[PDB]
């Protein structure tokens, strides 16, 4: 393989991935075209530029010794390769809920700030993408230190995974299960973003003099970049800067071996002591895996950015795009009520799987969306208008019984329509999962498309129930709640 052929291929890849979106109906074809080009490049390269002679668990002792010398907690847990979640931490003694059992001083972290002071510093000061996007900066920080045998962070880097289950690693037929879903567009964007960035930085490293000292000047493969961005997207956090005035992105060694379970955030940054601190989410008996709660993300975010699907995610949600139509004769009034309420005229809202399917913001939007002219004037004029605006997001204080019946009818119809745009039904998806033997990645894709439809089906039932509740209040001429 010649370096001129790879440079030609990355130039073609850069041009392909910088073109504008060819319209949603050609996105699958574009995705496959980009995949074909990436795989041609990947097959002509040697995988990860830097690989380590030992097994991943061979390096966990060095991680512990390094973390201990720099003031981190290293007693009371051990690293175990769990089947369901991969490597994680297991308690070696009983740990009580709310016990401060894990702490990591700032010196151990990799941050945008440590990226700036490293060998990447010169190129960082020149490139507009690196300056604007701390996540990409972290990824290149990871790669440069990985390729630096004397790096301070070598004990952390040598214990990182070598592969991930983000969609960047899926086969084409595994992504194909997601055709017609909401999620697949984010899969497309992730793949095109990553390919464009790889080609862009491949050329930048060649052309910039400030990149002459980087080990990436000698070797920078697609596999390198896919590994680095996947390492960052599955593990990065936001912390305050040392001054406490701004926030920065970081990687937190040792702590980021914890796997996810449902609960509440119990990890916080301690600025007085300058360290990350983790208290136990629940009691952990000796021999039990130590879990944390990653955050209130949807399963689409867990799959695309974290590389796993979480069963019983109580924060799961899908998107729903809604806006007041400029052809509506009440557009001006509706837009103004929405503006006074702090809500855009058009937006992407969320439908949740939990007991309230819609947020206060979505409820307020739908109320205005279905308001009559008389109702709109009562939200625009007079000494009670701001009071009425103030309660627009509150389920307890409807505008009118008729307004509620109209809005839940609309939501029922729209969620029903959204269900009819999927290639498969919920029952078909359950049959696929029961009757076929599938890879982990394939199961993630199918569970994701199943989960989108299950949220919409629950919204249909929820809206139908609410429509009947408010139709009852209307027929019984119940007094409206006030104040």
């Amino acid at each position: 393989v010649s370096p001129k052929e790879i440079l030609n291929l990355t130039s073609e890849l850069l041009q392909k991935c910088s073109s504008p979106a060819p319209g949603p109906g050609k996105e699958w074809e574009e995705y496959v075209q980009i995949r074909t080009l990436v795989e041609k490049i990947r097959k002509k390269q040697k995988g990860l530029s830097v690989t380590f002679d030992g097994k991943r668990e061979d390096y966990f002792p060095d991680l512990m010794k390094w973390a201990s010398e720099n003031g981190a907690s290293v007693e009371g847990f051990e690293m175990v390769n769990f089947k369901e979640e991969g490597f994680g931490l297991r308690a070696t003694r009983d740990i009580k809920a709310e016990e401060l059992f894990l702490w990591v001083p700032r010196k151990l972290l990799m941050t945008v700030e440590s990226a700036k002071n490293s060998v990447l510093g010169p190129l960082y000061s020149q490139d507009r993408i690196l300056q604007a996007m701390g996540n990409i900066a972290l990824a290149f920080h990871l790669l440069c230190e990985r390729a630096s045998p004397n790096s301070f962070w070598q004990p952390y880097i040598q214990t990182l995974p070598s592969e991930y289950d983000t969609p960047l690693y899926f086969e084409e037929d595994e992504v194909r299960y997601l055709q017609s879903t909401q999620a697949i567009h984010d899969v497309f964007s992730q793949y095109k973003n990553t390919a464009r960035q790889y080609a862009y930085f491949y050329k930048v490293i060649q052309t910039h003099p400030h990149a002459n000292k980087l080990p990436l000047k000698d070797s920078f493969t697609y596999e390198d970049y896919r590994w680095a961005v996947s390492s960052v997207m599955t593990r990065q956090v936001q912390i305050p800067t040392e001054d406490g005035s701004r926030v920065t992105l970081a990687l937190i060694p040792l702590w980021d071996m914890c796997n996810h379970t449902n609960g509440l955030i119990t990890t916080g940054y301690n600025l007085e002591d300058d360290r990350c601190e983790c208290v136990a989410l629940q009691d952990f008996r000796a021999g039990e895996q130590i879990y944390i709660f990653y955050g209130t993300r949807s399963n689409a975010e867990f799959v695309i950015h974290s590389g796993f699907f979480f069963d019983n995610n109580s924060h799961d949600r899908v998107k729903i795009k809604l806006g007041v139509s400029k052809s509506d004769r009440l557009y001006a009034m509706k837009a103004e009520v929405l503006a006074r309420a702090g809500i855009p005229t058009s937006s992407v809202f969320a439908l949740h799987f939990t007991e309230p399917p819609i947020s206060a913001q979505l409820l307020a939007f739908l109320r205005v969306f279905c308001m009559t002219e008389e109702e709109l004037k009562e939200h625009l004029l007079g000494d009670s208008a701001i009071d009425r605006i103030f309660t627009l997001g509150n389920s307890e204080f409807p505008v009118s019984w008729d307004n509620e019946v109209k809005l839940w009818t609309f939501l029922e119809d729209r969620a029903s329509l959204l269900l009819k745009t999927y290639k498969t039904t919920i029952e078909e998806d359950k049959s696929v999962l029961k009757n076929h033997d599938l890879s982990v990645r394939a199961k993630m894709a199918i569970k994701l498309r199943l989960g989108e439809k299950e949220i919409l089906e629950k919204a249909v039932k929820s809206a139908a129930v609410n429509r009947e509740y408010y139709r009852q209040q209307m027929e019984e001429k119940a007094p409206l709640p006030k104040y």
């Binding site: 604007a132 996007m133 701390g134 996540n135 973003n193 960035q197 956090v237 980021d256 955030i265 975010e301």
Partner: peptide
């Protein structure tokens, strides 16, 4: 509660052409 809550794998924008 926590002054600086820490979210593992916090979702960031990777679209270098958008914002």
């Amino acid at each position: 509660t926590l002054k600086y809550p820490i979210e593992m794998g916090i979702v960031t924008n990777w679209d270098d052409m958008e914002k």
